[PDB]
């Protein structure tokens, strides 16, 4: 008669690493590292991102004529951008503080687009109908749908002076531009003034632009350029616009309800809803593990990215049956 004292063993080839030994089989194991995404751009908490499609941030925000389908996309969880957007800044030029604007917009949860200086009544002394071949829309000449190119009327170019008080109770983003013609002949033909200026001020903001005449390399068939500038108004502040030529007017502006936790993702993955509390450019992560090896740049409630193939722990016994 006898008693033997021992332990169980089973059919398992999972192994763990140790400090003294590299290949230990176990009877039970857990894995702390997540290595798989579902391939889809899911909605964090069920709220969709702004999908830019083929347009850039400077395309969407300016009203680039061809990214029209997104002008109604008020509620944002994050931004999804194509790796190589083509639609934006249709009239070539420099967009000032673009990276900073991108960051400020990324955190906005709600965009109320509104007319700030309405086209029909704000400029009775100027042409508000100028359009370009570069900002083509369905084959027809057009322009950004948040901006107005103001040129002379009846041989005159009366001075522009108007202002807006921020009564939106949100920060207001006002975008405008400055035209830099390729030739003094266009400067006169369009604005009737050889020495134009553009001046924009607020209680604390102050910038003067001095349009330059120069032939630049031709881009999208333009020899000149329109630079874009912007600033935000705090509630109660005022933006004052003054010019004697070359102002591309701030027809539309955005009242921004600021949030946090959002950001911008560059991805060519399709959208398909799941509650992806964590999301990478490659798709959703849906797990509770402390680490991931899926992607270093993530958004949402994510496992920490680690450069490791496996983080397996042993919970069971060393698996050696006899």
């Amino acid at each position: 008669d006898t008693i033997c004292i021992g332990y169980h063993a089973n059919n398992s080839t999972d192994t763990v690493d140790t400090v003294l030994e590299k290949n230990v089989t176990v009877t039970h194991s857990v894995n702390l590292l997540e290595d798989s995404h579902n391939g889809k751009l899911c909605l964090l908490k069920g709220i969709a991102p702004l999908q830019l499609g083929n347009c850039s941030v400077a395309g969407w925000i300016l009203g680039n004529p061809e990214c029209e389908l997104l002008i109604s996309k008020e509620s944002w969880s994050y931004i999804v951008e194509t790796p190589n957007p083509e639609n934006g800044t249709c009239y070539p030029g420099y967009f000032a503080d673009y990276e900073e604007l991108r960051e400020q917009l990324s955190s906005v949860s709600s965009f109320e687009r509104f007319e700030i200086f309405p086209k029909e009544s704000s400029w009775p002394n100027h042409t508000v109908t100028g359009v370009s071949a570069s900002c083509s829309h369905n084959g027809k000449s057009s322009f950004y749908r948040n901006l107005l190119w103001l040129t002379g009327k009846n041989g005159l170019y009366p001075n522009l002076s108007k202002s807006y008080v921020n009564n939106k109770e949100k920060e207001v983003l006002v975008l405008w531009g400055v035209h830099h013609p390729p030739n003094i002949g266009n400067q006169r033909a369009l604005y009737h003034t050889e020495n134009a200026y553009v001046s924009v001020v607020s209680s604390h903001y102050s910038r003067r632009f001095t349009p330059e005449i120069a032939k630049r390399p031709k881009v999208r068939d333009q020899e000149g350029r329109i630079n874009y500038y912007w600033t935000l108004l705090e509630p109660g502040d005022t933006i004052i616009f003054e010019a004697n030529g070359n102002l591309i007017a701030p027809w539309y502006a955005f009242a921004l309800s600021r949030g946090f936790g959002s950001g911008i993702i560059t991805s060519n993955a399709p959208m398909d809803e799941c509650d992806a509390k964590c999301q990478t450019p490659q798709g959703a992560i849906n797990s509770s593990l402390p680490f991931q090896n899926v992607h270093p740049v993530t958004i949402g409630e994510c496992p920490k990215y680690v450069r490791s193939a496996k983080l397996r722990m042993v919970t069971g016994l060393r698996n050696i049956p006899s």
């Epitope: 042409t127 100028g130 000449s141 040129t151 002379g152 041989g155 068939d221």
Partner: antibody, heavy 124, light 105 residues
């Protein structure tokens, strides 16, 4: 390349409004400003005014109280209307397109006209 | 309107030789002047805009220059189809206007 043709009454009495329509053949209004020009026999041309299809108009102030210019919904037609004809209006009316500013820019003025019709003579 | 007139109300040129016309404005029009041809039963045709630049399709035979109030209109040679009524347009003011026109025969 766009070509224009005027059509309407060749006779308008002083108590009546003169209404002439221009049809655009081989084209459409296309973001350009379109004009009416007048020429009484024995005289040079007189500028009446223009219109952009968007509803933007510019008139010679001397005729402002009597002239309106409008566009149709076919967007290949537009028309001139002169009220209270005074018989000083016994002139040839011409349809013309304002010249394009540039190959890559329109919707702005150039100050002169590039295609013209032959014009129609109206007797009062 | 800026009243503008043409002194050579009519020209008479038998050979296909050079002919000139002129326009004089009561007020400066800078370089904002256009020069047109007109024939009875024909559509008017633009020759020159901006005082000196030819319109597309216009022969090298038509040229001109000027500024302010004084403009010179040159036809290098008259072909039989160029014995047209000619006129200038001033677009440096509002309303825009035209001269009385001249007849070339």
């Amino acid at each position: 390349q766009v070509q224009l043709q005027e059509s309407g009454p060749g006779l308008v009495k002083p108590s009546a409004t003169l209404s002439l329509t221009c049809t655009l053949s081989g084209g459409s209004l296309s973001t350009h400003y379109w004009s009416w020009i007048r020429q009484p026999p024995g005289k040079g041309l007189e500028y009446i005014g223009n219109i952009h299809y968007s509803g933007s108009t510019n008139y010679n102030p001397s005729l402002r109280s009597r002239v309106t210019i409008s566009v149709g919904t076919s967007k290949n037609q537009f028309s001139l209307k002169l009220t209270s004809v005074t018989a000083a209006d016994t002139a040839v009316y011409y349809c013309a397109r304002d010249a394009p500013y540039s190959d890559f820019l329109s919707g702005v003025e150039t100050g002169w006209f590039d295609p013209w019709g032959q014009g129609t003579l109206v007797i009062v | 309107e800026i009243v503008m007139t043409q002194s050579p109300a009519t020209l008479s040129v038998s050979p296909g030789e050079r002919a000139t016309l002129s326009c004089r404005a009561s007020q400066s029009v800078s370089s904002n002047l256009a020069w047109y041809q007109q024939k009875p039963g024909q559509a008017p045709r633009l020759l020159i805009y901006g005082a000196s630049t030819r319109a597309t399709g216009i022969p090298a035979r038509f040229s001109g220059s000027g500024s302010g109030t004084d403009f010179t209109l040159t036809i290098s040679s008259l072909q039989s189809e160029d014995f047209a009524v000619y006129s200038c347009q001033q677009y440096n003011n509002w309303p825009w206007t035209f001269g009385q026109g001249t007849k070339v025969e």
